[PDB]
Amino acid sequence: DFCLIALASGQILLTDVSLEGEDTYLLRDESDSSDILRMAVFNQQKHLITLHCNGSVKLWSLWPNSVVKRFIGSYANLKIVAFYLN
Amino acid sequence: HQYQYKDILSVFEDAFVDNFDCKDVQDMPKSILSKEEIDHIIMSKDAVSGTLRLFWTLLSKQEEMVQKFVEEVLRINYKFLMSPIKTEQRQPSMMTRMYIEQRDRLYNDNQVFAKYNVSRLQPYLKLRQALLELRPAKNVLIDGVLGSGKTWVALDVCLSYKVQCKMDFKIFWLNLKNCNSPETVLEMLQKLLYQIDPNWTSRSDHSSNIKLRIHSIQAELRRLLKSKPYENCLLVLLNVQNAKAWNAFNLSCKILLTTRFKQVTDFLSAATTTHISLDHHSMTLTPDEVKSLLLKYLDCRPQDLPREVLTTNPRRLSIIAESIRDGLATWDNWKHVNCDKLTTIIESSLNVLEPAEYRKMFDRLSVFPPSAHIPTILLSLIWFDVIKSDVMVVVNKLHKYSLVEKQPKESTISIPSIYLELKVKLENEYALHRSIVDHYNIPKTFDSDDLIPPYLDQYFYSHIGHHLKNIEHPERMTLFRMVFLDFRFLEQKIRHDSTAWNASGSIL
Amino acid sequence: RMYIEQRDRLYNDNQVFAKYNVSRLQPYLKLRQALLELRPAKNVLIDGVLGSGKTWVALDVCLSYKVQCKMDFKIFWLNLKNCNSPETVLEMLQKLLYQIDPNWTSRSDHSSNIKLRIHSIQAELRRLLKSKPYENCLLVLLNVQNAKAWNAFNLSCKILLTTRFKQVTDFLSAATTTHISLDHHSMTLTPDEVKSLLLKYLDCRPQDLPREVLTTNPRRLSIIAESIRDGLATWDNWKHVNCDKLTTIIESSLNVLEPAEYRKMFDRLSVFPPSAHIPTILLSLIWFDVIKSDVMVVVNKLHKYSLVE
Amino acid sequence: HQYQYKDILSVFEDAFVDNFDCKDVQDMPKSILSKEEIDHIIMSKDAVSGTLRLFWTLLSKQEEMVQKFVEEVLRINYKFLMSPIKTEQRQPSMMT
Ligand SMILES: Nc1ncnc2c1ncn2[C@H]1C[C@H](O)[C@@H](COP(=O)(O)OP(=O)(O)OP(=O)(O)O)O1
Numbered sequence: 001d002f003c004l005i006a007l008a009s010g011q012i013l014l015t016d017v018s019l020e021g022e023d024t025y026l027l028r029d030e031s032d033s034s035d036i037l038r039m040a041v042f043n044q045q046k047h048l049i050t051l052h053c054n055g056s057v058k059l060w061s062l063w064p065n066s067v068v069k070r071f072i073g074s075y076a077n078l079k080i081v082a083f084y085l086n
Numbered sequence: 087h088q089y090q091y092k093d094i095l096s097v098f099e100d101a102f103v104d105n106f107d108c109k110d111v112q113d114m115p116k117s118i119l120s121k122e123e124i125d126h127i128i129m130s131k132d133a134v135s136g137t138l139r140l141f142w143t144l145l146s147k148q149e150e151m152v153q154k155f156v157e158e159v160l161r162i163n164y165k166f167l168m169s170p171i172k173t174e175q176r177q178p179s180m181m182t183r184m185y186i187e188q189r190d191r192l193y194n195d196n197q198v199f200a201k202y203n204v205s206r207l208q209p210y211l212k213l214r215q216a217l218l219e220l221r222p223a224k225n226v227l228i229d230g231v232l233g234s235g236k237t238w239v240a241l242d243v244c245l246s247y248k249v250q251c252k253m254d255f256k257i258f259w260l261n262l263k264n265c266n267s268p269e270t271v272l273e274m275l276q277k278l279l280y281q282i283d284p285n286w287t288s289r290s291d292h293s294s295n296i297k298l299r300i301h302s303i304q305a306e307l308r309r310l311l312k313s314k315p316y317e318n319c320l321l322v323l324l325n326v327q328n329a330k331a332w333n334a335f336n337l338s339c340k341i342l343l344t345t346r347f348k349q350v351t352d353f354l355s356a357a358t359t360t361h362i363s364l365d366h367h368s369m370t371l372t373p374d375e376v377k378s379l380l381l382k383y384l385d386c387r388p389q390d391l392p393r394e395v396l397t398t399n400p401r402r403l404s405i406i407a408e409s410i411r412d413g414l415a416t417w418d419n420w421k422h423v424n425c426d427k428l429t430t431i432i433e434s435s436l437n438v439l440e441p442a443e444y445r446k447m448f449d450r451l452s453v454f455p456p457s458a459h460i461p462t463i464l465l466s467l468i469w470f471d472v473i474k475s476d477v478m479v480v481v482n483k484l485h486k487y488s489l490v491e492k493q494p495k496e497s498t499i500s501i502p503s504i505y506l507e508l509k510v511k512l513e514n515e516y517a518l519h520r521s522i523v524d525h526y527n528i529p530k531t532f533d534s535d536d537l538i539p540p541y542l543d544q545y546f547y548s549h550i551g552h553h554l555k556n557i558e559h560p561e562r563m564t565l566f567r568m569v570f571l572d573f574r575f576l577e578q579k580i581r582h583d584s585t586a587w588n589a590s591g592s593i594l
Numbered sequence: 595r596m597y598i599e600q601r602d603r604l605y606n607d608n609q610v611f612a613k614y615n616v617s618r619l620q621p622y623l624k625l626r627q628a629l630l631e632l633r634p635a636k637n638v639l640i641d642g643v644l645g646s647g648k649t650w651v652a653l654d655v656c657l658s659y660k661v662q663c664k665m666d667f668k669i670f671w672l673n674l675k676n677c678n679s680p681e682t683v684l685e686m687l688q689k690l691l692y693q694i695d696p697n698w699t700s701r702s703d704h705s706s707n708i709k710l711r712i713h714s715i716q717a718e719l720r721r722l723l724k725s726k727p728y729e730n731c732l733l734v735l736l737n738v739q740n741a742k743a744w745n746a747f748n749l750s751c752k753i754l755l756t757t758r759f760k761q762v763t764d765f766l767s768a769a770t771t772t773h774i775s776l777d778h779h780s781m782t783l784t785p786d787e788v789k790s791l792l793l794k795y796l797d798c799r800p801q802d803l804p805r806e807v808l809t810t811n812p813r814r815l816s817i818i819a820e821s822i823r824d825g826l827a828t829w830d831n832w833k834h835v836n837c838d839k840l841t842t843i844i845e846s847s848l849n850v851l852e853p854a855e856y857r858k859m860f861d862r863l864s865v866f867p868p869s870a871h872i873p874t875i876l877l878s879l880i881w882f883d884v885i886k887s888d889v890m891v892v893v894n895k896l897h898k899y900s901l902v903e
Numbered sequence: 904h905q906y907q908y909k910d911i912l913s914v915f916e917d918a919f920v921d922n923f924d925c926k927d928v929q930d931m932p933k934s935i936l937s938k939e940e941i942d943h944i945i946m947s948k949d950a951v952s953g954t955l956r957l958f959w960t961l962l963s964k965q966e967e968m969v970q971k972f973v974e975e976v977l978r979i980n981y982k983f984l985m986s987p988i989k990t991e992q993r994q995p996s997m998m999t
């Protein structure tokens with residue numbers, strides 16, 4: 001309940017203000033993740049899940065990288081399908 | 087004699103460059119390379135970067151690791167690369183010894199690359215590009231603001247083999263650090279003479295005309311240099327201080343410069359020379375770098391790295407990094423920041439100016455809240471010791487000394503920097519009230535009227551209240567325009583967002 | 595014969611290995627290792643606190659054959675013991691010139707600029723040295739006193755150092771040089787050694803050896819050992835310990851500092867009970883002649899001189 | 904003067920011997936080597952045989968094929984071998 005991330009083509013981390021006098025602003029400008037299907041956030045904020053059209057895994061760090069290789073790694077289009085396990 | 091892999095390894099790259107890529111292989115025995123290491127290498131965009139950052143990592147390690155690394159490649163599909171490298175033993179190529187010797191005579195510049203530096207990539211890379219090319223009359227400037235580590239990037243590229251072989255192992259260093267008037271030039275010139283040959287007879291007469299005399303030496307030099315083998319050499323000039331001066335050494339080939347002062351980098355022209363600027367934002371200290379540099383002084387895990395981003399200048403970064411490894415500032419304290427060295431460097435650095443004519447005038451500039459822009463028209467008020475157009479005359483006369491004004495070139499002046507600010511304690515005695523107060527001159531004239539007021543640019547909306555800091559508080563609480571809704575909104579007028587429904591991506 | 599001759603010209607340093615020393619092993623052994631290797635631009639420091647016999651371990655290894663053959667029987671000794679300012683350098687440099695060849699014409703002009711002048715010599719030297727046979731030589735520098743200075747002699751190959759002052763061993767860096775520290779506890783005077791050294795002065799059976807363990811520094815160990823073979827202290831008395839020599843050595847050894855700025859300040863340090871640690875915060879009280887952060891400034895300004903802090 | 908690959912090719916082998924094996928690569932553009940050809944080579948029991956029977960096959964062919972073969976290695980993962988062989992042109996080593 002500190003920041004608020006929002007972006008389209010900018011890949012930038014922004015700030016969220018909670019009623020109260022004090023507020024915060026921040027600039028990020030990460031490298032382009034553009035044309036992702038969907039986006040989420042992890043619990044310890046040090047990890048960032050990312051998936052692409054053809055598919056990929058790109059990790060980022062909020063504190064101011066992709067391998068399709070080895071097993072499987074087939075060439076084809078990735079769907080919206082995704083989820084978290086235990 | 088026996089050489090040592092990390093000595094020799096840096097020699098052959100091109101072969102190692104072209105036909106091999108790091109990303110091809112992560113075998114990664116963990117002692118020899120950390121994970122983060124190869125994590126970082128592959129991120130580079132091309133071999134000339136990719137292959138390169140490899141070496142600089144290895145050569146930072148103890149020989150055993152490397153000693154194993156030359157073996158490790160064998161197990162990889164391709165050993166063909168490591169058979170030559172095994173010609174270390176009893177076979178330094180009769181050339182290579184020239185190199186492997188000389189860099190030592192270069193490291194006997196000692197401190198320099200002994201302990202401290204972390205390379206760089208971009209500024210390095212452009213330079214080798216140029217400095218590989220130039221033919222025997224040309225130049226490469228290196229311009230930087232105070233500190234900003236030009237003298238080093240200067241060296242470091244001159245250390246890299248493929249250069250050192252291009253120029254035939256003859257590289258002559260000087261310092262014009264003290265160069266003024268004919269006399270001094272003769273000295274710092276005459277030294278250069280001895281290094282080329284240890285024979286010079288005084289024979290050209292000692293006739294008391296100093297101006298004549300050098301022009302005899304400079305002759306005797308000019309022939310000798312371009313004459314013989316010694317056909318490809320480069321002088322290097324560190325801290326060129328006289329816009330002449332330069333013309334002392336013109337005779338040569340392949341020379342190279344470093345300069346603070348604007349008037350030099352202006353005096354040269356892209357026709358016969360190139361540039362390397364270190365202010366250009368792409369060139370300067372990727373925040374990832376600061377980690378590595380700020381590391382080697384503190385000798386502590388990356389958890390112990392500073393948070394909040396201090397600055398990119400290597401100078402003033404060291405003083406911090408150093409003050410913590412020894413003196414005060416706790417690494418968490420620093421307001422004081424070891425003023426002496428910081429001062430003693432910045433202080434003499436200002437010694438150039440006309441003291442009453444000018445050095446009085448910086449003292450004024452402490453009026454201003456840091457990092458902003460200052461309207462030149464506004465600047466007219468402050469001094470009023472010298473009058474009228476001299477303002478633009480001043481800034482220019484000032485500006486020519488490196489960013490000591492720091493031109494924006496629209497209806498204003500810009501802070502010279504943190505440094506020439508950062509120094510000390512405005513003093514200036516009487517100045518404050520009247521200078522802060524009277525510089526309120528603009529608004530009270532306009533108070534209440536129709537439509538949109540003639541109110542001054544983007545400076546007033548910001549810091550006009552700062553100037554109130556020295557004024558009567560009720561008199562401000564009147565005109566602080568907490569009260570006034572008219573003026574006040576016009577601040578965020580200009581303020582928009584690049585993106586979404588919020589503030590910035592452009593402006594808060 | 596080259597060897598068996600030259601060590602004599604080395605022993606005609608006389609006193610040195612004439613009577614007194616008992617070798618050592620560890621500090622010896624590391625050094626020969628390094629000093630056998632280095633190629634013609636390198637260094638080996640030898641750092642030690644006052645006394646601690648660096649100048650000797652310096653020699654002794656340079657006496658051992660397998661070295662002496664590696665370097666082709668050319669070894670040149672100097673002392674920078676008095677080296678300050680350009681003038682002196684020119685001297686203690688110019689001497690070195692004669693030993694290499696007994697021909698040097700003044701030909702490079704006598705022009706009154708001292709700064710220029712050496713840089714002419716230093717040239718004329720640099721060529722000659724690396725030029726010919728004389729390809730492998732080593733200078734040796736005893737008691738390097740100016741952090742420059744050093745830069746006087748840079749031109750050469752294979753040189754070697756000895757230094758008290760911290761600021762030297764800091765100024766160099768492990769990149770182009772190695773270290774040998776004599777403070778490192780493994781390096782220093784196995785108590786079995788003290789027996790042998792303390793023997794040769796007193797000339798008496800091991801029953802006559804001192805009991806209670808006096809110290810490991812060769813310096814200040816001799817003064818004891820010597821004061822007994824001749825003067826007072828009974829070998830059982832010693833509180834006085836021949837203060838003069840002990841003083842006259844330690845006294846000048848402090849002569850470097852700014853007297854009122856600093857030498858006043860040691861006088862304070864006598865406050866403290868020996869061998870302990872002193873909180874720097876506590877240190878703030880004592881002087882109060884110069885103020886505030888200068889404390890950490892002082893210790894540093896002090897510390898750079900070898901462990902004087 | 905200009906030399907011709909099948910003239911020069913036979914010179915350096917050892918390099919070509921050690922770090923390369925025919926069996927490693929059958930790309931086999933059919934004009935340059937018949938099937939039976941490489942059918943026969945790999946059957947050899949060792950490099951000193953293996954690498955060898957290669958050359959004797961090539962040198963029995965018209966230069967075009969070889970002229971293409973020195974290019975063909977490029978497309979294979981390893982071109983490092985063919986950069987020297989491209990020092991045919993204007994650089995017969997004063998020995999060779
Ligand atoms: N690549 C670098 N890595 C780490 N520290 C550096 C680097 N470059 C410069 N520094 C720091 C360490 C050096 O001790 C410090 C010295 O300042 P320096 O680089 O010589 O400035 P400069 O000489 O290039 O400009 P100036 O003439 O104003 O000093 O700068």
Ligand SMILES: Nc1ncnc2c1ncn2[C@H]1C[C@H](O)[C@@H](COP(=O)(O)OP(=O)(O)OP(=O)(O)O)O1
Binds near residue numbers: 614618
């Ligand atoms: N191996 C040794 N064996 C016996 N005595 C030694 C030995 N080394 C040094 N000493 C004693 C005897 C010498 O007379 C005495 C001389 O001091 P010295 O060793 O020259 O100190 P040093 O010169 O190395 O450091 P400093 O410059 O402070 O004197 O040291």
